[PDB]
């Protein structure tokens, strides 16, 4: 049971690590594909046009 709870908490740790990686990746995607896209489309594109 100690080993089983060790792997259970380890799976909770794995869910935490996966969620951190997924949130980091989705923040990177948000930045580079929405925030950077808005930076272009407004600050360069819309204002220049």
């Amino acid at each position: 049971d100690i080993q089983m709870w060790k792997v259970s908490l380890q799976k909770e740790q794995a869910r935490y690590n996966q969620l951190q990686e997924q949130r980091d990746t989705m923040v990177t995607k948000l930045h580079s594909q929405i925030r950077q896209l808005q930076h272009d489309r407004e600050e360069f594109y819309n204002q220049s046009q």
């Binding site: 060790k6 908490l9 740790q13 930045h31």
Partner: protein, 138 residues
């Protein structure tokens, strides 16, 4: 104590989970409070090696303990010799500084007030300013 705990951490990296690390960080905290007055070059060296191995295992993510308290303890001993450890500490603390997160400006304020406006190690301040630049670009 520091030698035996050195073999503990360098071997049983993974078996040390978070409650155990909450204890073991306080072990290191007592060791660091003693480092002020025990004064020996050999003790300085081995304690520095221990924290260096903890730092390595943190980069390897073999350390699974509380990073908040561990890097607080690094901060208390940040005034000490190890160089790359300071770069690691500053890079870590950058994480708690982000426009979406609460108190991020204040955390950055503390980070620079300690390691930018009250510091002189050139690489350390370079990295603090690079962290600020990354915060501004984000």
């Amino acid at each position: 104590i520091v030698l035996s705990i050195t073999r503990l951490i360098k071997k049983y990296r993974k078996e040390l989970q978070v409650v155990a690390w909450d204890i073991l960080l306080n072990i290191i905290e007592r060791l660091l409070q003693q480092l002020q007055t025990l004064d020996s070059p050999e003790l300085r060296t081995i304690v520095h090696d221990l924290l260096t191995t903890v730092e390595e295992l943190c980069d390897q993510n073999e350390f699974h303990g509380s990073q908040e308290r561990y890097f607080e303890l690094v901060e208390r001993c940040a005034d000490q010799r190890p160089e790359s450890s300071l770069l690691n500490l500053i890079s870590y603390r950058a994480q708690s500084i982000h426009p979406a997160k609460d108190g991020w400006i204040q955390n950055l304020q503390a980070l620079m007030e300690r390691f930018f406006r009250s510091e002189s190690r050139g690489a350390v301040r370079i990295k603090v300013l690079d962290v600020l630049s990354f915060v501004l670009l984000i």
